[PDB]
């Protein structure tokens, strides 16, 4: 359709995407050479010329015919609503990406599973993320941040040690969460009960093929016969995962 | 008319309004999309094109003649009372919107009724709100927050177990009523005994036709002689309700 | 008088005045319209045309002849004493104001009484202030802070459970702030055993007519006859109380 | 001999005298009016016409004539040495005064006794300084700093809560430390086992009659002839104590 | 403002002041050297560095405006009636000088007590004063004068032996206040029954900072109302005591 | 074929490199003087003029044929992988330098072995690091840091006592380590179970001969038949060791 | 040839010198007055004009010949070796100053011997240092710090009670070992088994005549024929000892 003059990234809290390295491409796939499995014990190291396919994320809204024909400001209205919704599913593919059919391969699928052996009789949830922050070290890279579920972070932050003394100072700073001196990501994307820690800033990279643009058709499908309108917001992403060992995913067993 | 430029989100909590998605417009009404019948079993989903009328919210507080003209700084004072007095009534329309005649249709009206079948012998009020957050999921959407009445939130915070300890006490968790971890909005406007859980930021949208303007008359009605004054503040809103199933309304029964 | 407008502000920083809304005027008295009785149940709302008279606050202290002649820097010491002493009695009128005669009506006089019925078998002093914060909700506004007496606050911070652990992040909790996510100003300006919780920031407003000034007499009363000099310090205020229901005053009964 | 261009206290950590308000005067004594006994309950307040005598602190130094003429930079140093030693004994008076004849009446003498009734079954040293910081509230002034003895304050930074983890770790924060969030002062002047909390910048004031200076003559006793030396160093102070209630002094019972 | 050296009616004898040595100073206080203990036998003399503060003596009189402002009238009257009236209270400060707060350190407060061991089996009140005159000697000073109470002096002046002959005659031949060739000084200030003998002309001396100055108020207390006027008379002097042992006070046992 | 100068050298951690003294040279070897054997008992000290050869540290990343042809920004990215990869393997030579054939003589080899003698019945791992910090003293220089393996550091931080309390309230002391008040480095290049303590800043120095230059080949070995590449990134370093006794290498025995 | 300006050498490295008062002169000697005999009981203090000769300390190291002219990396390195090498024996002359002919007289020589009588049956080494800090009081001065040998500090460190708990020394605070609170200096220069306590900052003073100079010779003895390079270090100091009784030197009885 025609040029949506505005491209709005986000508001209140933006986290999952801004953690990864970004760069653009102009192809339908990407090839590179990364380290696959480092079996540290006789030790061995696996390598691969892995392929990273690009997909087409897109969701649409079916506003009235009237909406576009008039479109005094109701156009810009919806134009800022698709760019936002597309970012939600984008944030969902970049993290909890199933890796299945057409879905992207998300941080959580690639990630190396948390080492259950680090847990010790009587560790607090906090202790676990701590252990986790360590497991990243066995890769030989520094952790970048902690991605917990808003609810879980709000149970960990409000955690007082055995002595009642406030550990994280619960209330204090929201969204930045300098847990262990490291910034935390409280996103609703992260499924409750699941936690992710790694050195995102250089373990994976997002590759843009086409900027998020919003187009609107009035002659798509049986719309012209049902008085309907499709407002497609397309986008082509390709999430690479240079180092899996630098990312970890586990589960709180309470 | 004077200068109505006091965009001031109070000094505490931006309630109910900031929970919804906002947008501009310049029309008499708005036709859109809504989820009609979600046949969950092969499953199917129905959508329709509903109408959302734009109502002229004109709140008013009876004043007097002498008061309004004597004080110099009163010019800016009356401005801080009408931009706030309108926001209080705006909340009463946004949440508990009657739907009758000219009133707006608000969250609590549209909302799908809580499912009594989820309760189980011996559940705490907290257990219910939990069941609630789940019901939102039967619509395949994530919940956004919990809207309780300040009083109810207080009693839920002081919940004890069988030994006498305090279960996730909310003394500190007041601003961040974040129940189990979902940022609650202990909004005043919520009727005591009633609770609302939903994915607000993706279920309804507030449409602004005209910024909150403030006017004052002395010759309107029997004011001039009864030493009175009408404090009229006009504003044109329009509350949309895309996905009703995403919002839930229940009642604590005890 | 040859008095400088120099003031070494409350160093440690205090807050009976800083809690309230401030604004200036150039009138003998201020008029407005507040909310009297909000009977929340058929509900009703009472309003009234109220007048907030400007009162001149001027405290003083006498002196000897040896405090007048030399004046190299003693002329400036007496200043810092009255400039501060005027502020001490200021907290006395804005808090425990009698309201009789020429005095001001203070937060504590106007405030609605605490609801004894909220107390429960075995609540901590903290549990009370909690109930208090709620009572403020019955007005439909959020509380802003907690005004306790330095000794009471101290005994609350040092609260212990049945195991022996400390409650409020342990012992150190001085600057009397975030007591349950809410700043709690400590000034025995507040009578011992008495507490005040309310939405100060928008329930009452301080109106200034004239900045504080100092003055000295030599022929004021018994002075000249008894070898004395009376040193004054004038100021003109005007306290308004828009929402009485937003402020609560109770007593720890034990 | 008037010949000692630019001499000021240096090194160390800057305490004291700096904690107190400073001023000039051209008299051998100072008169004022302070508050004696504040009976806070009908309440009453006692006042007294007090006098603060000016006391001289002096001390010469013998250092050969050749070491004066041939050693000019050493002269430049003997000055820095005397200036220091003078200001060192100055600290002694200002803190551990006496009232005895020529000595100054200092902070610790004027001080109000610590209230033994605030202690509770099982308080740590810290807990006490805490109670103390409170006792200063009864005066209705804010505590300014904590004056402990280097060794005591030392045995404080290494104060971990009952659960091994430090209440406050043992970094250093030498004297700039904010115990409880307030500036402390570990001076060897403060007697071991003695602690002083107060609102110094308000409670007392140092009065200078003459700046600290160093002169050279070489005519004292059988010196000018038996080859000895005379290099003086003197000053005239006067410590006043306005509010004694603002200064607290106690003892750690080990 | 116009008459400093006025022909004030001097009670024939300038009584106490005339007995002392007089000087002048333009300072707040005075630093001299007294003699504490003189052991006359190897002999030894003890000295001490003492300080004598300057105080401001003052009294007052009420009078009408017109008659006060007239100028050729009571102006010259009140100027002479006050310089004398002040001399009566000044006379009480130089003798019964409390030595306390604002009071002067008077002759009686310093005196060494009379030596009862000198009294002889049955000797007149006269004999005692004579003994006192001797007791002075052990200071190394000659006694200067005698200070009795008027009534007492009168009775001591009418003393008779066993037959009738006046112990010293006196009627008609009475020269002018002089017993044993020593002045009598009949002062109302000298408490009845008490007597002071010492070497005033050298052992102690008065210290004038300012000649008797007088001001007049009109708006002083309820004067402007009752048509009154307050006439504060000022004068600031001190009193040193170079030899305590030289001054002696006792009590007539009768 | 040159592409990047040096881009951005090191990212997260700067260890062995930054812990050591740096300087550059333009020769193939260096000659200096170090301490050989310190016989501490008559005591003696041996010295030796030693030669520090320049060794070439080169780490390569096997690339694909696709990587080159499709590099509009992909070639730029690979450069950001060799600048960090060379520095990563650099921490492995400057630390675990074998000493065989060409490998550099690294800290761990040169270092004087830990004195098993110091270990005592029942010592925590921390006790050992302490013991080690001491052993450095026998050289007569003080240590400057502790280099443990990230995992080991984690277990040392979560060290509990007999009651269960946490000796070090530093689970967040993950980033950097200030164990025993010393700037420890969690350089994981450090073998698991191996620890290094010394006065690095004064024991060894890194000598740069040539900045990291990069060349690319496609016909080396049997690449052209395997669709591979060899991006040789050469670098010429020279690790000197002035004071071996200042460094210590130990092993936790448990 | 020209030695560059003063570099920051010992990072975290300086005590003995940094402990003493530092002055600066431009003469080859300094005549002050040390305290000869202090008879603490009527007490008396004896003084005597003492000469503090300005000696020139030196320390030499060996080096390369052909690479000297290069610099090109060598001369700049050889510079940083004598700048610190001069400071190694610097503490040796100020601490263990022999006193023989040209040597300096150091703290440990001037010092008053420890009083064996304070030792009590069964005292920890800790107890001794305590006793020591006291013996300094007997001279009537405040102790400044404790100078133990690194090893000794480590043993006083791991001190345990009868149960098995650790007393204090050794842990994190292993730096300025504030034993009790007096900063302990674990310097290498202090002979093993010897301890020095005093009020350094006031007992002695270091006097600088000329900044650190360093010279090089190549024709020195066998050098030119043996391919060697001797390098002396020059500097003019002057250690004065004002109050000897303030310093103490003892020995632990093992």
CB contact under 8 A, D29 and E53: yes
Host H or E run for residue B236: strand B229-237
Q: How far C224 CA lies from chain D's nearest CA (Å)?
A: 18
Q: At a CB cut-off of 8 Å and minimum separation 6, what does B76 contact?
A: C23
What residues in B contact A192, CB-CB < 8 Å?
Answer: 181
**Token couple for B213:** 């303007």
CB-nearest to F181 from G150, G174, G188 is G174
CB atoms within 10 A of CB G40: 11
- Mutation to test the C interface, candidates D27, D30, D31, D164, most C Cβ within 10 Å: D31
- For B202, the 3-state DSSP assignment is helix
Best D165, D166, D167, D169 residue to mutate vs chain A (most A CBs within 10 Å): D165
Total residues belonging to chain E: 254
Question: Cβ contact (<8 Å) for F169 and D170?
Answer: no
Task: Give how far Cα C30 sits from Cα of B61, B77, C27, C239, Å.
Answer: 18, 11, 7, 9
Assign C112 to helix, strand or coil. Answer: strand
d(CA C190, CA C16): 9
* Contact call for residues D47 and D35 (beta carbons, < 8 A): yes
Q: Which of C190, G22, C167 is nearest to D137 (CA)?
A: C190
A48, A36 in Cβ contact below 8 A?
Answer: yes
- Contact predicate D126/C172, CB 8 Å: yes
The C-alpha atoms of residue E146 and residue C247 are separated, in whole angstroms, by 76
Task: Identify whether the C-beta of residue A52 lies closer than 8 Å to the C-beta of residue A207.
Answer: yes
Q: Which of residues 49-88 of C touch E (CB under 8 A)?
A: 65-66
Dist CA G205 CA G21 (whole Å): 5
Rounded to the nearest 10 degrees, the angle between the axes of helix G125-137 and helix G150-157 is: 110
Closest listed residue to residue F95, CA positions, set F203, F214, F228, F226: F203
CA-to-CA distance for F101 and F89, rounded, in angstroms?
17
Pick from G32, G172, G207: CB nearest D63: G32
Domain of E26, CATH number, reads 3.30.2400.10
- With CA atoms as reference, report the closest residue to A253 among A127, A168, A143: A127
**CA distances (Å), F57 to each of F2, F31, F78, F233, in order?**
19, 20, 19, 9
Burial class (CB in 10 A: 0-12, 13-18, 19+), E161: exposed
Contacts of E165 (CB under 8 A, 6+ apart): none
SS3 for E88-136, per residue? HHHHHHCCCCECCCCCCECHHHHCEECCHHHCCCCCCHHHHHHHHHHHH
DSSP states of C52-69: EE-EE--EEEEE-GGGTS
Put simply, the answer to whether C181 touches A165 (Cβ < 8 Å) is: no
Which of C65, C218, C221 minimises the CB distance to E56?
A: C65
**Half-sphere exposure (CA, 13 Å, Cβ side) for A68?**
19
Sign of CA dihedral E146, E149, E153, E159: negative
Determine, for residues D67 and G32 on separate chains, whether the beta-carbon distance falls below 8 Å.
yes
Q: How many helices (H) and strands (E) does chain B have?
A: 6, 14
Tokens of G221: 């003895």
A50 - beta bridge partners? none
Taking CB atoms and an 8 Å limit, are B32 and A188 in contact across chains?
A: no
Please state, in angstroms and rounded to a whole number, the distance separating the CA atoms of residues F111 and D159.
Answer: 37
Strand order of the β-sheet with A230-240 is: A21-24, A205-217, A230-240, A55-61
- CB-based contact D144 C170, cutoff 8 Å: no
Packing angle of the helix pair G150-157, F125-135 (nearest 10 deg)? 160
> CA–CA separation, G113 vs G196, rounded Å?
10
Range list of β-strands (E), chain A: 21-24, 29-31, 34-39, 44-48, 51-53, 55-61, 112-113, 145-148, 184-186, 194-198, 205-217, 230-240, 247-251
| Residue E4 within any structural domain of the chain | no
Chain centre distance of CA F131: 22
- Chain B residue with minimal CA distance to A11? B21
Nearest to C144 by CA among C177, C122, C112, C121: C177
3-class state of residue A90 by DSSP:
helix
Closest CA relative to residue C240, chosen from C52, C31, C54: C52
Deposited resolution, Å: 5.2
Contact D208, D237 (CB under 8 A): yes
Examine residue E105 and state whether it is found in any structural domain, yes or no. Answer: yes
* A159 contacts chain C (CB < 8 A): no
Q: How many beta-carbon pairs under 8 angstroms link F with G?
A: 66
By the 8 A CB rule, do G159 and G126 touch?
yes
Q: Which of A26, A33, A177 to mutate to test the interface with F (most CBs of F within 10 A)?
A: A33
- Is residue F10 one of the residues assigned to a domain? no
Answer yes or no: is E6 within a domain: no
**φ, ψ for residue A50, nearest 5 deg:** -65, 145
Neighbouring subunits of D (3+ Cβ pairs under 8 A): A, C, E, F, G
For chains F and D, tell me whether 3 or more CB atom pairs sit within 8 A of each other.
yes
**Distance (Å, whole) CA G105 – CA G96:** 8
- Residue F158 touches partner D, C-beta closer than 8 Å: no
Residue D104: is the preceding peptide bond cis (ω within 30°)? no
Range of the domain at G219: 16-251
Q: How far is F238 from chain A (nearest CA, A)?
A: 24
Cα dist from D211 to D7, D9, D26, D80, D208, whole Å: 10, 12, 12, 14, 7
In terms of DSSP bridges, do strands D21-24 and D204-208 run parallel, antiparallel, or are they unpaired?
parallel
The shortest C-alpha distance from E101 to chain D (Å) reads 8
Query: Helices F125-135 and F150-157, interaxial angle, to 10°?
Result: 110
Tokens of A243: 């180092």
Q: Are G and D close enough to touch, i.e. 3+ CB pairs under 8 angstroms?
A: yes
Q: Give helix C150-157 / helix D125-135 axis angle, nearest 10°.
A: 160
| Cβ neighbours of C169 in A, within 8 Å | 164-166, 169
| Order of strands across the sheet that contains E204-214 | E21-24, E204-214, E233-241, E55-59
Q: How far is CA D194 from the centre of its chain?
A: 13
Q: What angle do CA C161, D143, D13 make, to 5 degrees?
A: 110
F227 CA to centre of own chain: 35
Burial of D42 (0-12, 13-18, 19+ CB in 10 A): exposed
Question: Quick one: closest CA in G to F162, which residue?
Answer: G165
A25 close to A12: Cβ distance less than 8 angstroms: no
- CB-based contact (8 Å) between C186 and chain B? no
Residue C198: C-alpha distances to residues A239, B150, C114, E168 (Å): 52, 14, 11, 91
**CA-wise closest residue to D201 among D147, D145, D136:** D145
Query: What are the DSSP calls for chain E, one per residue?
Result: ---SS------SS-HHHHHSEEEE--SSEEEEEEEEEEE----EEEEEEEEEE-EEEEE--B--HHHHHSSSSHHHHHHHHHHHHHHHHHHHHSSS-B-SSSS-B-HHHH-EEP-GGG--TT--HHHHHHHHHHHHHTTT----EEEB-HHHHHHHTT-B-SSS-BTT--TTT--SSEETTEE--B-SSS-TTEEEEE-HHHHEEEEEEEEEEE--BSSSTTHHHHT--B--EEEEEEEEES-TTTEEEEE---
At A30, give phi and psi (nearest 5°): -135, 135
Chains C and B contact (Cβ–Cβ under 8 Å for 3 or more pairs): yes
Residue with tokens 């803190």: D95
Give the separation between CA D33 and CA C230, rounded to whole angstroms.
12
Residue D7 C-beta-side C-alpha neighbours within 13 Å:
24
Angle, CA of A77, A83 and A89, to the nearest 5°? 135
Distance from CA of A149 to the nearest CA of B (A): 8
Residue D29 contacts E where some CB pair is shorter than 8 Å: yes
| Span between the terminal Cα atoms of chain F, in Å | 51
Q: Does residue A10 fall inside a structural domain?
A: no
Q: What does the block give as tokens for F158?
A: 């979560």
A164 vs C166, C178, C181: nearest CB? C166
In this complex, whether C and F touch, counting 3 or more CB pairs under 8 angstroms, is no
Residue with tokens 């909005």: B185
Scored b (16 or more CB within 10 A) or e, B162-192 reads eeeeeebbbbbbbbbbbbbbbbbbbbbbbee
Residue F53 is assigned to a structural domain of this protein? yes
Hey, are the CB atoms on C127 and B158 less than 8 Å from each other? yes
Report how far residue C161's alpha carbon sits from residue C154's, in angstroms, rounded to the nearest whole number. 16
Q: What tokens appear for D98 in the block?
A: 């006496």
C-alpha–C-alpha distance, residues A131 and A135, integer Å: 6
* Cα–Cα distance for residue pair A85/A233, rounded to 1 Å: 9
H helical segments located in F136-232: 150-157, 200-203
What's the angle, vertex CA G101, arms to CA G97 and CA G107, rounded to 5?
20
Backbone angles phi, psi at D225, to 5 degrees: -105, -35
Instruction: Enumerate residues 6+ apart whose C-beta is below 8 A from F191.
Output: F96, F149
CA E42 from chain centre, in angstroms, equals 37
Report the number of distinct structural domains present in chain A.
1
Nearest to B11 among C33, C47, C201 (CB): C201
Ramachandran area for residue D162 (φ above 0: left; ψ -120 to 50: alpha; else beta) = alpha
CB contact (8 A) between residue D33 and residue C73: no
Bridge partners (DSSP) of residue A197 are: A146, A248
The string of DSSP letters for C153-188 reads HHHHHT-B-SSS-BSSSSS--TT---TTSS---B-T
| Token code pair at residue D115 | 């209230």
Q: Do A150 and B32 touch (CB under 8 A)?
A: no
Which of B167, B131, B91, B168 lies closest to B250 in space, CA to CA? B131
DSSP-assigned letter for residue F245: G
Question: What is the three-class DSSP state of G179?
Answer: strand
For the record, the structure tokens of D7 come out as 């001499």
Strand A247-251 and strand A112-113: pairing?
A: parallel
Alpha helices (H) along chain F = 16-19, 65-69, 74-96, 107-110, 125-135, 150-157, 200-203
How many angstroms separate the first and last alpha carbons of chain B?
50
Compute the 3-state secondary structure of chain A and give helix, strand, coil in percent, each to the nearest 5: 25, 30, 45
Nearest by CB to A164, which of C170, C178, C181? Answer: C170
Q: Which residues of F touch G174 (CB under 8 A)?
A: 130, 133, 180-182
Which parts of B60-124 fold into alpha helices (H)? 65-70, 74-94, 107-110
Neighbours of A11 (CB within 10 A): 8
Torsion angles phi and psi, residue A88, rounded to 5: -70, -45
E98: which strand partners?
E105
B44-65 residues labelled b (16+ CB within 10 A) or e (exposed): eeeeebeebebbebebbbebbb
CA angle, G37 then G39 then G42, to 5°? 140
Q: Report the alpha-carbon distance of residue B12 to residue B175 in Å, rounded.
A: 8
Whether residue G149 lies inside any domain: the answer is: yes
Q: Is A170 on the interface with B (CB under 8 A)?
A: yes
Task: Check if A122 contacts D (Cβ < 8 Å).
Answer: no
Q: Report residue G59 as tokens.
A: 């320390």
Give G20: exposed, middle or buried? Use CB within 10 Å, 0-12, 13-18, 19+. Answer: buried
Q: Please report the number of interchain residue pairs, chain A to chain D, with beta-carbon separation below 8 angstroms.
A: 12
Tokens 């406007």, located at residue: B189
Structure tokens at B47: 């959508």
Please give the radius of gyration of chain D, using alpha carbons only, rounded to the nearest integer: 22
Whether B223 and B13 have beta carbons less than 8 Å apart is answered as no
Continuous H helices in F13-146: 16-19, 65-69, 74-96, 107-110, 125-135
Q: Which residue has the tokens 């992988």?
A: F81
Q: How many CB atoms lie within 10 A of CB C75?
A: 15
Token digits for B138? 């039967």
Q: Is C221 on the interface with E (CB under 8 A)?
A: yes
């Amino acid at each position: 359709m025609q040029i949506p003059g505005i491209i709005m990234p986000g508001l209140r809290r933006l986290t999952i995407r801004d953690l990864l390295a970004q760069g653009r491409t102009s192809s339908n796939a990407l090839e590179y050479v990364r380290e696959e499995v480092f079996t540290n014990n006789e030790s061995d190291i696996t390598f691969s010329k892995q392929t990273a396919n690009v997909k087409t994320i897109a969701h649409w809204v079916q506003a009235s015919r009237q909406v576009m024909d008039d479109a005094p400001m109701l156009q810009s209205y919806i134009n800022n609503r698709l760019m936002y919704g597309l970012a939600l599913k984008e944030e969902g593919q970049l993290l909890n990406g199933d890796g299945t059919g057409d879905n992207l391969e998300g941080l959580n699928k690639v990630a190396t599973a948390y080492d259950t052996s680090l847990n010790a009789t009587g560790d607090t949830r906090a202790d676990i993320i701590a252990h986790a922050i360590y497991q990243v070290t066995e890769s030989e890279f520094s952790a970048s941040g902690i991605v917990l579920n808003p609810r879980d972070w709000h149970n960990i932050a409000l955690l007082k040690d055995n002595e009642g003394r406030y550990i994280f100072g619960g209330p204090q700073a929201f969204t930045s969460n300098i847990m262990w001196g490291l910034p935390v990501v409280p996103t609703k994307a992260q499924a409750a009960g699941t936690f992710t820690v790694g050195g995102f800033d250089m373990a994976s990279q997002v590759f843009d093929r086409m900027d998020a643009t919003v187009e609107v058709s009035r002659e798509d499908r049986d719309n012209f016969v049902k008085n309907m309108l499709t407002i497609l917001c397309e986008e082509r992403l390709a999430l690479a995962h240079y180092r899996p060992t630098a990312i970890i995913k586990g589960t709180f067993s309470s």
